[PDB]
């Protein structure tokens, strides 16, 4: 039989109040707190914390302060990653981010979700679906990414967009819901 | 004659810089600060603070850190309430929330508003309209609730939604503006 | 030849990792940190910090806590300015705000942007376009303002709006994208 952590990672229904998960979420908030309390000139310190927090980190990385995570280890990031002010990463499942990806302020990537049915939801069962972002992607400010979304290479997501469906590579996409408005040279 | 606090609660025009209201807003920020400075394993402490902050609290409650309120006492919450990261409650008027309601990160419930006319607005007069959320409601990430909105039981509001009109029970509602897209079994 | 700071202010392409700009961004975060760590009854202190932070400040000003800026000096604000909880000012270029303007919580004003082309973007080059807000303007909660936007006098921007095009004076504007829905008496 699977553990609650295993059900979680596999996109199945799990109980978040599982002791192991609660204490993993505690460990995450400790590093998060340490990260957000650092001083503006403590780049070395922040970088170390990110390497303990995230599942995988490239050579260079810059995440502006007040970062929000659930577990940290489900966050996998490529080279030269940039995340601006107040980004939220609900990494119940894998948030896999490619190379040269930069996040504007207030970008929210949610992998978690709840049952539509109230009785199921009120029971405490919960789900996750991994999010994928390709190489060379600029994500605008206040963009929301929903569970199970894949974003291709060479994509520019306009500010305030709500990504509900997959966005193909080599496109510009804006809106609520988020749709392609332009193609671009590869 | 009514006091400014009374005008506020009754949905009438009031001056926010009223001495009583300013010092009530100060008291609110003190508890808010205490709440947001707690350590990740201080559940007992956070729970106590919420019972001093909110108008009414159920048996169990979990609000993730960095909460934003104006007064606190206008916030009335039911059983098993959950509020994720960085929720904002502008409780100029009553924010009444039912049982088994869970808020995703960055949910913003605003009850306050200003006069459309500039001269009225520049005079400092201000208004409020209470917000109502029924039992068994899942509110998505980055959802904004406008003043005077009532949300029925069994409602799922999709992420990034902007609730401008009332949402009937037993529905799924998304978008900007927020509209019903599905009905659901009761 | 122009410096990187000069290219920035002039709307041209610049490298943000320029030593002068990095240390100006450090100075900004120091004041920001001091501002956000103040206690709820330290109005005098916050006001002083804002006068060191912002390019220009009127007689009276109230900015609620957790403010986010990049440089500060590009932010020019008029009389009786109000900014509520968690506003973000990406002032790569000039953010010029008129008199009697009030910002609701979570208002995000972005002047910065990146090249559409990935190779240009991955090179580290970056741009800015100034944002202008007229006198007597109420900006709703969670409103996003994109680079190069001018907002006229007597304008009410509804909550959750995403301003992508210029908004004429004497109008009410909502939506994603943000459009005029009403005219109003001057
Ligand atoms: C340092 C850092 O981390 S970056 C900091 C900045 N943060 C940000 O969020 C900035 C993001 N920049 C944007 O969102 C811009 O709007 C861009 C890049 C998407 C603009 O791309 P463009 O395709 O050139 O927009 P353009 O002005 O040419 O017109 C696009 C059309 O779609 C609309 N549109 C553009 N952006 C958006 C948007 N974000 N949301 C909704 N609609 C939009 C326009 O209104 C226009 O409509 P229309 O022509 O049918 O009338
Ligand atoms: C631990 C916690 O606190 S929870 C943390 C997570 N935070 C979140 O915000 C997650 C919320 N989940 C969502 O918003 C999901 O999108 C859900 C639950 C609304 C999806 O519901 P569904 O009805 O099953 O969406 P579905 O994929 O079937 O299709 C719905 C249609 O409306 C659209 N749609 C779905 N969600 C949204 C949305 N949030 N905004 C705009 N449009 C949407 C879809 O594009 C689709 O359009 P179409 O069929 O006309 O082409
Ligand atoms: C203390 C402080 O700092 S303020 C704190 C509060 N923060 C806020 O964000 C509150 C802002 N208030 C709002 O956004 C309000 O919705 C207002 C002021 C824009 C309402 O203005 P009104 O024109 O009177 O809205 P009204 O109810 O009359 O109807 C407007 C129409 O546009 C729609 N609409 C109204 N507001 C919005 C919105 N924010 N987004 C999208 N659509 C909207 C309505 O659905 C309605 O549609 P319809 O008539 O075609 O069916």
Catalytic residues of B: 114
Helices A19-36 and A43-53, packing angle to 10 deg: 170
What gap in Å lies between CA C9 and CA C88, rounded to an integer?
Answer: 19
Nearest CA in chain C to A171: C116
**B170 alpha-carbon distance from chain centroid:** 21
Question: Cβ contacts of residue B27 below 8 Å, gap of 6+?
Answer: none
Q: Any idea which residue has 């170390």 for tokens?
A: A48
Nearest CA in chain C to A142: C144
For chain A, state the CA radius of gyration.
17
| Cβ burial, residue C47 (10 Å; 0-12/13-18/19+) | middle
Atom of ligand 3 nearest to the CA of B162: 40
Which chain C residues are closer than 8 Å to A66 by Cβ? Answer: 66
Ligand index nearest the alpha carbon of residue B112 = 3
Elucidation method = X-ray
* A182 annotated binding-site participant: yes
Is residue B21 left, alpha or beta, with left meaning phi > 0 and alpha meaning psi from -120 to 50? alpha
Q: Which residue's alpha carbon is nearest to atom 33 within ligand 1?
A: C164
Which chain B residues are closer than 8 Å to A86 by Cβ? Answer: 86
With a 6 A CB cut-off, is C160 part of the ligand 3 pocket? Answer: yes
Atom of ligand 2 nearest to the CA of A114: 4
The values of phi and psi at residue C114, to 5°, are -120, 160
Let me know the angle formed at the C-alpha of C122 by C121 and C124, rounded to the nearest 5 degrees.
Answer: 75
Cα-to-centroid distance, C162 and ligand 1 (Å): 10
What gap in Å lies between CA B133 and CA B144, rounded to an integer?
Answer: 13
Query: To test ligand 2's pocket by mutation, which of A144, A149, A164 has the most ligand atoms within 8 angstroms of CB?
Result: A164
- Cβ distance A105 to C68 less than 8 Å, yes or no, reads yes
On whether the CB atoms of residues A89 and A123 are closer than 8 A, the answer is: no
> Quick one: three-class SS letters along chain A?
CCCHHHHHHCCCCEECCCHHHHHHHHHHHHHHHHHHCCCCCCHHHHHHHHHHHCCECCCCEEECCCCEECCCCCEEECCCEEECCCCEEECCCCEEECCCCEECCCCEEECEECCCCHHHHHCCEEEECCEEECCCEEECCCCEECCCCEECCCEEECCCCEECCCECCCEEEECCCCEEEEECCC
Q: Residue C53 corresponds to which tokens in the numbers above?
A: 């932070």
CB environment C145-180: b (16+ within 10 A), e (fewer): bbbbbebbbbbbbbbbbbbbeebebbbbbbbbbbee
Question: Cβ contacts of residue B89 below 8 Å, gap of 6+?
Answer: B67, B68, B69, B70, B75, B95, B109
On whether the CB atoms of residues C52 and C34 are closer than 8 A, the answer is: no
Q: Concatenate the DSSP letters of all residues of B100-131 into one string.
A: S-EE-TT-EEE-EE--SSHHHHHTTEEEE--E
Q: Is C76 a catalytic residue?
A: no
Domains and CATH numbers, chain C: 1-186 (2.160.10.10)
On whether the CB atoms of residues B172 and B184 are closer than 8 A, the answer is: yes
With a 6 A CB cut-off, is C140 part of the ligand 3 pocket? Answer: yes
What gap in Å lies between CA A40 and CA A64, rounded to an integer?
Answer: 9
Fill in the DSSP letter of residue B170: S
């Amino acid at each position: 039989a699977m553990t609650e952590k295993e059900k979680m990672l596999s996109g199945k229904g799990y109980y978040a109040n599982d002791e192991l998960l609660v204490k993993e979420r505690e460990y995450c908030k400790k590093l998060t707190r340490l990260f957000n309390n650092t001083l503006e000139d403590e780049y070395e310190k922040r970088e170390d914390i990110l390497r303990q927090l995230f599942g995988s980190v490239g050579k260079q990385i810059n995440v502006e302060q007040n970062i929000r995570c659930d577990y940290g280890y489900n966050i996998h990031v490529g080279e030269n990653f940039f995340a601006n002010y107040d980004c939220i990463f609900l990494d119940v499942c894998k948030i896999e981010i490619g190379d040269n990806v930069m996040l504007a302020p207030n970008v929210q990537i949610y992998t978690a979700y709840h049952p539509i049915d109230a009785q199921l939801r009120n029971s405490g069962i919960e789900y996750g679906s991994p999010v994928k972002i390709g190489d060379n992607v600029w994500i605008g400010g206040g963009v929301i990414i929903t569970p199970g979304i894949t974003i291709g290479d060479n994509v520019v997501i306009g500010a305030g967009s709500v990504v509900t469906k997959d966005i193909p590579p080599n496109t510009v996409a804006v809106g609520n819901p988020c749709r392609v408005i332009k193609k671009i040279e590869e």
